[PDB]
A paper describes a structure:
The cap open reading frame encodes three viral proteins (VP), VP1, VP2, and VP3, that form the capsid shell. The AAV capsid is comprised of a total of 60 VP monomers. All AAV capsids exhibit T = 1 icosahedral symmetry, but only the shared C-terminal VP3 region has been resolved, while the extended N-termini of VP1 and VP2 are intrinsically disordered. Within VP3, the central core motif is an eight-stranded β-barrel (jellyroll motif) formed by two sets of four antiparallel β-sheets (βBIDG and βCHEF), with an additional βA-strand and one α-helix.
For AAVpo.1 and AAVpo.6 capsid structures were generated from 512,823 and 539,729 particles, resulting in final maps with resolutions of 1.79 and 1.77 Å, respectively. The amino acid sequence could be readily built to the density maps, starting from amino acid 198 for AAVpo.1 and 217 for AAVpo.6 which is comparable to all previous AAV capsid structures. The lower residue number for AAVpo.1 is due to large deletions in the VP1/2 common region. Amongst the AAVs compared, AAV5 and AAVpo.1 share the highest percentage of aligned residues (99%) and lowest overall Cα-RMSD value. Both AAVs share very similar loop conformations in VR-I, -VII, the HI-loop, and VR-IX. AAVpo.1 shows a ~2-fold higher transduction efficiency in Lec-2 cells as compared to Pro-5, indicating a preference for terminal galactose. This behavior is surprising, considering the high sequence identity and structural similarity of AAVpo.1 to AAV5. The sialic acid binding site on the AAV5 capsid has been identified previously and the substitutions of methionine (M) 569 to valine (V) and leucine (L) 587 to threonine (T) on the AAV5 capsid resulted in the loss of sialic acid binding ability. These residues are not conserved in the AAVpo.1 capsid explaining its inability to bind sialic acid compared to AAV5. For the AAVpo.1 capsid, this is not surprising as there is little sequence conservation with the AAV9 residues around the 2-fold region. In contrast, AAVpo.1 is not recognized by mAb1-6 and weakly by mAb2-7.
Author numbering:
A (entry chain D), B (entry chain H), C (entry chain 2): 198 to 716
Write the structure that this text describes.
Amino acid sequence: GADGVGNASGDWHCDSTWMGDRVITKSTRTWVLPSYNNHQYLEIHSGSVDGSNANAYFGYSTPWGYFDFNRFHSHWSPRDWQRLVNNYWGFRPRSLKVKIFNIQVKEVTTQDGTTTIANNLTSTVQVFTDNDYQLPYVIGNGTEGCLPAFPPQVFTLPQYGYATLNRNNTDDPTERSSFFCLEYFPSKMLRTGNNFEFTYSFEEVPFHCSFAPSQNLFKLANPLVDQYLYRFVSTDTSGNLQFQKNLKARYANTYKNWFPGPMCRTQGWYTSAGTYNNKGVANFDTSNKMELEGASYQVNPQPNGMTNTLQDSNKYALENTMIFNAQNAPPGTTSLYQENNLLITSESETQPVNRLAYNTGGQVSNNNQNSNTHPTVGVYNHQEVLPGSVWMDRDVYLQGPIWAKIPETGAHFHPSPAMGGFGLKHPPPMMLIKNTPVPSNVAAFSDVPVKSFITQYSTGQVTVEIEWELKKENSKRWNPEIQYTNNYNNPTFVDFAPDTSGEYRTTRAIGTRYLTRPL
Amino acid sequence: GADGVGNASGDWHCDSTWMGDRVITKSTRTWVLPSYNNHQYLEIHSGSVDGSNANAYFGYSTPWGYFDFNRFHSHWSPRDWQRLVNNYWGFRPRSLKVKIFNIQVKEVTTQDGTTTIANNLTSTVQVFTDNDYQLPYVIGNGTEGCLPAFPPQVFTLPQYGYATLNRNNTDDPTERSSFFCLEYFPSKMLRTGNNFEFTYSFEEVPFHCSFAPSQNLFKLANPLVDQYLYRFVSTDTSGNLQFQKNLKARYANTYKNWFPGPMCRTQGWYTSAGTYNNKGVANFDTSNKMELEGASYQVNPQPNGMTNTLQDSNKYALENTMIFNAQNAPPGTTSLYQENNLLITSESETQPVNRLAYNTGGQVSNNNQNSNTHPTVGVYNHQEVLPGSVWMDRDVYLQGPIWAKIPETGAHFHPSPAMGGFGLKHPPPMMLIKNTPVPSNVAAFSDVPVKSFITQYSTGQVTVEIEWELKKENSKRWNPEIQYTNNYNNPTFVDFAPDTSGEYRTTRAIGTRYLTRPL
Amino acid sequence: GADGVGNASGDWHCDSTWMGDRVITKSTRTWVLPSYNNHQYLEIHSGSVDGSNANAYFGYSTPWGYFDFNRFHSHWSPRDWQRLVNNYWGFRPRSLKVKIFNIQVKEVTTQDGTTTIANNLTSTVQVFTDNDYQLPYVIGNGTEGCLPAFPPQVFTLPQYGYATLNRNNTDDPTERSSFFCLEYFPSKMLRTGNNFEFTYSFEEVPFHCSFAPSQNLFKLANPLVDQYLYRFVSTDTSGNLQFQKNLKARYANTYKNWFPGPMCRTQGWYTSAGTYNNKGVANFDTSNKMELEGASYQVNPQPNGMTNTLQDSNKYALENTMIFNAQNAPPGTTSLYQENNLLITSESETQPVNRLAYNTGGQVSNNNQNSNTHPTVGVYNHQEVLPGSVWMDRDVYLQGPIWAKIPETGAHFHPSPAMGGFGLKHPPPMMLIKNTPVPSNVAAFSDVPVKSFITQYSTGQVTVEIEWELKKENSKRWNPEIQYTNNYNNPTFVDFAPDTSGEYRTTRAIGTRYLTRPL
């Protein structure tokens, strides 16, 4: 932008603007960027870890870092989120603007145990966006490093890396393994006066459904009126078939037009009461898994179409659950966490249309009845998509992801990501940034590449603006709705606020489904 | 319409008009409307009934009643239906017009065991349509109360009620239970001179397929020509692999492009011969079921994609069958019915592409073969939608439903209702009507609402006009087709006609699939 | 309107329409009108009753009845009210439309213990509005007879009567007592085809404040900074004056710009725990009272400016409280009611700016200090309006009144009615209606007025439409707000819904103050 050393290249924008059918969120944060890998690209790999060869991989770490705004709380204050979920039947993203500005590059020198930091006014950072999706898209896998929830917090940009193909579930590559060089893209170079701006339009995507059903999928018939349909009930002692009319309100017997969503049975576990759970279990051997390339992988939180719990029940299908930490956690922690440390979400709103993850799905005939053979049924633990099936996709959370990239295979079905949010063919592109290397003193020629660099890091601001489209509520429900509310019994701190040490406290996961609709 | 006491507000229209690619049906009937619940809204509920807690519910009954034209015989005479199904490959509804007129409100007084009926010229009825689908949509669940099949028959409008959510499969409500007040809508008020008119356009929907396949899905290859493809046949005594060419007409061995529809195995039962059936069976424990919200429900007639019987066979998968009564039945009857009382439909036309409901679906490899281990297979009793699968949706019947509302969840697959007919996102809206309350003598003030009303009922005519689009047959079949025909051996009455007592007799269910097409 | 016998003169309108800054409510109800006093005007009076001569009065009852829509639930469904109070900082009425239509006049004859009811097609009702406020305005005194909360309920119009002046607190009139004849106004006469319409604009009036303060009136100073002001603290042993700086956050000592509202101390009583209350008290002798014309009257709920309770406390100043019945009650009941029968409102939201009704207001110096005389203070139990005082007026409730007429005296202060709502100089005018008398058989002349009339009553519909202006919330609060929500533990019925007998159940009083604002 050529603002120059003494002129700011942008202003602080954090706001929300509510229009009748649209809302515009604006978020600004301060970032800091290390020089990762000391300006080197490094092959990274691993064999089997923790007794699973699904943990083997081959890939690369890069000197670059990237901006990740793919969580709802990056854009939405808690109050704004409340206003959203209490009043609207749905929402979707429409457009995006990003600005990176007020660049400051610092040099670091260490001498005799003391560290000195100074401006380097002539250094650059490099920024580009991968508009054609030519790089592995690591955004939307639920990884850390997003713009923080709380605007004053200063955050470190995560390092860009990726896994390509590995051979036979080992740490070796294959002939098809790809290396991607990020310097092989055009990128803008910014000194301290320069800035970067980017605009993007979302593709057409369905509204997220921010309502809960007020009817049960199998109870849709008028309770006052019989069906004109008849069901087989019994055989008499001579084997003749006997039938009965399907009476009003007998929902066990009514013919059905529509069927519940697909399910994969998932083990149920009791929360807050240990005495009901089986003691000293190691989950991993009995976890739900899918096989790929000769290895077994955990598939949490299972495909869409189930509910992980019943309302006002302490039993959860944990592998069907999005589980968040109430606090930020250090990288690499292996510590065991307990329920009170975590935010365990509930999909219970969808229980009228989604099957319960920890029960059987149903039963079908498994034999051929005859004079000597009584009819029998088998139960089933999984059932995939059926003609005429309906379900609700997983809810989104203030703490949760927004979008995910639909993999490019040429074939898919119902592209809504398991974690929740908007499946996108062309998502917001990766935004990559790195500190340009500055060599240190070099006296003599060599054909060997320079390895010795001045230690530098950079800092600046980033602004993200998203236009959201809203779907208005159009309910005729007479009695009041359930609404998210700030109710606490004798609080010692304000939730969604900094505490006495300045830590931002969040003790609840807030979903979107409060208002109701009939089916 | 302000016609006035002595002027009719509409005329009787029952006709059909056949245009080349369209047909317009017009139906007029006389209705009678009780004052249900004596102008009160009543909470209705139930616990477990007949040993099933799937029969528990919570809901409301309303003073309103509603017009239900959602059966084919409301619009189609038997002869017209014959003309449709013998000559056309498909049809779909396009537009709708409804008129309610010639309102007559009667007051009823009972004194000393004698009942007197008189006109009340100044009373009103109230009518409205739920255009935004803001109320539970109870139409399209197969319940009674439709416009009668036979035009002179006078019918009672059914009472509007609905089930909302209940708690833990009991008779209690939950926090999410909805109460809907129908007086919270604008509605037109009609005295005896007034009328009501409504028009509606159907959304684009696929033609119903009124043909049967003349080829088997697995027999599509030219019987005169070998495939250029080879199959594994055996291993020799040294374990070497052996292969053979797939020969002409060997349809057991041909490679396949396409696969049959999804299936859920359903128990088969013999009709008209009791000796083959298992004696004294109570079906309910061994019925097919699906689990929802912690309860088990019968899912008849199963999802689309199966056939319930084979042509010229007496074995039926009864829970895969639409079963109608030949006669109208009284409300609430628990009597046992026998086969000769009922119309048991057959989907046998689809047997070349739909799998047979009472057999296994197939078999797949269940182990890993090696030097010491012979290959084995398991059979499967259910198989859901596969890539490249094809099937035919259930046929529609003169006696059967027309449309159903697709539930509003944001996610579904192949929205064609299990019962048969057209799945609609925005179906013809509920048309609701009630007798406006007229208080009786009130001498003194009270803040308590008036409970004492003059007993009234109303009667009038309703006309429904539907424009249907037709898909012309374009067959090159040389030999004659199967056609629905009026063939009876020594009849003692005319079918689809009133008998000596005036009862309208219908002894057959008439489907649509007579003409054939190659695949 | 001259619709005629067989033509409806209006339609049913109950709806709400939400525009961005305005909301339009439309309500329609069915009414029934007795012929009160058999078409006679009657002097009514009373002496001392229950030992209080404040109960003496002189006045008149009229044959007329009147429409009273002066309660919020006449216009607002519970869900709509929820939407209002959760999202907006205020509202006020703007315009009004009323229609009376579908008139039906019935004649009643009783013979041998049996009652017969028939239409009288040629009878009239008479309607007029008192546009110039020339009659005693009885609307807005908290009396029964309003349009019901629940739209299907049919209600009886209350009888119009009024009290004029009485002599010396007895049952006699004075020379200044006024008799008002309602037939001395022009009025429209309606047969069964006719209707009546009226439109009205509200005067400019302040928005009701639908928010609660998030700051305490005495805590407004920055807690991080000292005042530059000093306070007298002590005298030393020689009598010299000593002073100290007012330190940061010491809100006991800070100089104040502003002062709390006016108060009248009111006795506090414990709810739900009887053991803390004084036993067997008769309240009336110790009630708060004001004297007028030589008699003593209870002044509940006291003037504005107090709070009746503290948050999460069981102590209430009951005479400072609006107390509603959860149910409709019969006229004239003397039964004792208990807390669980009643809705006891809480003004606790205003506790940061309004003084607590059951404590003392403060203390002031009551003597002159000197060498021999220690300073003393008296406490005070009442304090009226002070310069620089601020307070919040009483909240409004879904169950409560909307407006009140400011008395016409030429002098008043802060005209907001004690009960809550909008003080209006020219409120919506009285709407009066009566059944025109129809004499019975008269054979001979007399100069004495006819006393013998055919017994008649009338019924019809009334529609009321109000345009409301809204004040949008403009909060920067980061953390979530308190919101009214439909939370019930194991409900056996749906609140704000009809129960199994059809009774409309309301177990909560819903105020407007949920959102917060800083001072």
